[PDB]
Amino acid sequence: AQADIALIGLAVMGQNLILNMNDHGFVVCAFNRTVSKVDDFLANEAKGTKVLGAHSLEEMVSKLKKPRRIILLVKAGQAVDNFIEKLVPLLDIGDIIIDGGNSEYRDTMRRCRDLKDKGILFVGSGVSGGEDGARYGPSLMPGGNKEAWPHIKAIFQGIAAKVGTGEPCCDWVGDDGAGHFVKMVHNGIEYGDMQLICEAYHLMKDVLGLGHKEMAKAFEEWNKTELDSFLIEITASILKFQDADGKHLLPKIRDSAGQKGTGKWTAISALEYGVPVTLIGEAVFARCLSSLKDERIQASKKLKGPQNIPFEGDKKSFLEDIRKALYASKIISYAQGFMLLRQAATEFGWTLNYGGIALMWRGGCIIRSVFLGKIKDAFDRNPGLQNLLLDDFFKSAVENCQDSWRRAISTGVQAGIPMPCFTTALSFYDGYRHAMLPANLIQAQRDYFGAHTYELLAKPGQFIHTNWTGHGG
């Protein structure tokens, strides 16, 4: 007993989190599957620090203060289970295993129940921020068995990012897989914001004819308005970036976007639980589309676009329209993501604090922006808020942006610039707005061909089947 916590998994994420913990006065015992890396770390990044090294699992467990707290930061799937299996004969009742990898939420609840009745307290935490986020202040989203929380709270909230009011970007999310489900939705929303930015960029490049310097200048301005965020900031950096030959690097890199599952899982969860999370849907499919790079080369040779009509209009005004279209569409994505959280809370009986979740996304994480602060405000003044768009700030923001947004979609449509996320946000906005929607025709159709029955608009509850086929003869 010397170390406050142990971390198994010495990739750069692990190492940075150990160093961050050590910088806050926590003695960490490091371990890795390939044990050589432990000495390597101790000689190099960890030289002259309070961290201990371990060369066996049994040794690492004896270095720990009781309750033994141990973090796992290994590749999600089987490895987590393999490590869990090995640690349980070695642990006392009341000891805490913490999985920080991007595990999917259903494995986390399985593991949590199983370990709970073996007396071992489990928590799956999402970590967001990447390498130097992890190093100097990550966003941490813990969930699992709450008996664990008071024991890890000091470490977790200490290494976590801080919001200018002194609050940590880390607090207890909920039971079982809540932290990991929230982490997944975080990534979903990240995909959406990235796709939105790409569409704004495409309108500037191809409608407006902007070179990457003016285009980066436009992004820098936007990062000083309501769009102030990490992602807007670094996009301006990326556009300005010149490679070794003097020319801009971005138009040289291949347009086939990768994915590591977390974004599609959000989309699949929304489909499974019947939540219209359309923009993340479109973002995920927009990446799949770009993967089909060879087909698109061949399609560009064959398929024809619109008549090339030059843009005649004040470019500065159009640049303003793209800014507001982007912000309006961002508002719908976030409303949809927060609808998904509301539904998972209902499905799995989690009591979630949405303003808590907003505060946890305010810093540390990739999606950080002033915008999350406005969402915490929305939930602070009404905790039971049903949808983000029903809050006056968002109501007024979308209402203000409406013109520009419709004008940017119609101009993009005219010029043939693909806007999967900008268009689906307006479709959802106009869909959500309408008290009466043409889905009654779908219900009439289903009853004509598969006798599925329908409700009358006055007294839902009764279900009718009409013999549509012939009303005489």
Ligand X SMILES: O=C(O)[C@H](O)[C@@H](O)[C@H](O)[C@H](O)COP(=O)(O)O
Q: Where in 225-244 is the site for a second copy (CB under 8 A)?
A: 230-231, 234-235, 237-238, 241-242
Q: Is 62 helix (H, G, I), strand (E, B) or coil?
A: helix
Residues 6+ positions from 247 with CB-CB distance below 8 Å = none
Q: Which does 277 bind (CB under 5 to 8 A by kind): ligand X, a second copy, none?
A: a second copy
Part in contact with a second copy (CB under 8 A); list of ranges 159-167, 178-186, 302-310, 348-356:
302-310
Work out whether the CA dihedral 381, 385, 387, 391 comes out positive or negative.
Answer: negative
Q: Please list the alpha-helical segments (H only) found in 274-361.
A: 278-291, 293-302, 315-348, 354-360
369 is in an annotated binding site: no
List the catalytic residue out of 63, 183, 324, 376. 183
Is 214 annotated in the active site?
Answer: no
Task: Mark residues 378-417: x for contact with ligand X by CB under 6 A, - for none.
Answer: ----------------------------------------
Stretch that binds ligand X, among 126-134, 213-221, 267-275, 331-339 (CB under 6 A): 126-134
**What is the Cα–Cα distance from 124 to 211, expressed in whole angstroms?**
45
Binding track, positions 177-206, relative to ligand X; x by CB under 6 A: ----------x--x----------------
Query: Is the Cβ of residue 120 or residue 398 nearer to a second copy in the bound state?
Result: 398
Interface with a second copy (CB under 8 A), residue from 89, 164, 245, 302 = 302
CA 361 to chain centre: 9
Cis peptide before 67 (omega within 30 of 0): yes
Q: Is 393 in the site for a second copy (CB under 8 A)?
A: no
The item of a second copy, ligand X, none sharing an interface with residue 102, based on CB under 5 to 8 Å by kind, is ligand X
Minimum separation from the CB atom of position 439 to ligand X (A): 12
CA angle in degrees (0–180, nearest 5) for 190-194-196: 115
Query: How far is residue 216 from each of residues 287, 317, 419, measured CA to CA in Å?
Result: 23, 17, 20
Is 92 a binding residue for a second copy by CB under 8 A? The answer is no
Give the binding range for ligand X (CB under 6 A) out of 127-135, 174-182, 268-276, 320-328.
127-135
Between 253 and 458, CB nearer to ligand X: 253
Nearest to 419 by CA among 112, 207, 175: 207
**Residue 46 counted as an annotated binding residue:** no
Does 319 bind a second copy (CB under 8 A)? Our answer is no
Partner whose footprint covers residue 217, from a second copy, ligand X, none (CB < 5 to 8 Å by kind): none
Q: Burial, 112: exposed, middle or buried (Cβ in 10 Å; 0-12, 13-18, 19+)?
A: buried
370 in a labelled binding site: no
443 binding ligand X? (CB under 6 A): no
Minimal distance, residue 199 CB to a second copy, in Å? 7
With contacts defined by CB under 6 A, name the span among 128-136, 160-168, 403-411, 463-471 that binds ligand X. 128-136
For residue 33, say whether it is annotated as part of any ligand binding site: yes
Query: Cα dist. 37→14, 20, 31, 204 in Å?
Result: 12, 19, 8, 48
Residue pair 339/387 in contact (Cβ under 8 Å)? The answer is yes
Name the residue nearer to a second copy (CB basis): 43 or 390: 390
The closest alpha carbon to 175, from 126, 124, 140, 139, belongs to: 124
Q: In the window 98-117, what residues touch ligand X (CB under 6 A)?
A: 102
Among 79, 88, 250, 345, binds a second copy (CB under 8 A): 250
Asked if residue 75 binds ligand X (CB under 6 A), the reply is no
**Do the Cβ atoms of 188 and 367 come closer than 8 Å?**
no
Among residue numbers 259 through 278, which ones bind ligand X (CB under 6 A)?
Answer: 259-260, 262-263
Q: Find the distance separating the first CA and the last CA of the chain, reported in whole Å.
A: 89
In sequence order, the β-bridge partners of residue 124 are 99, 143
Q: Which is nearer to ligand X, 127 or 425 (CB)?
A: 127
In whole angstroms, how close is the CB of 62 to a second copy at the nearest point?
35
Q: Which of 22, 24, 20, 4 is CA-nearest to residue 12?
A: 20
Helix (H) or strand (E) holding 78: helix 78-87
Hey, what's the torsion of the CAs at 439, 442, 447, 451, to 10 degrees? -110
Q: Is 190 a catalytic residue?
A: yes
* Residue of 190, 199, 226, 282 with catalytic role: 190
Catalytic residue set: 183, 190
Residues lying near ligand X in the complex (CB under 6 A) are found at 102, 128-130, 187, 190, 258-260, 262-263, 365-366, 446, 450, 452
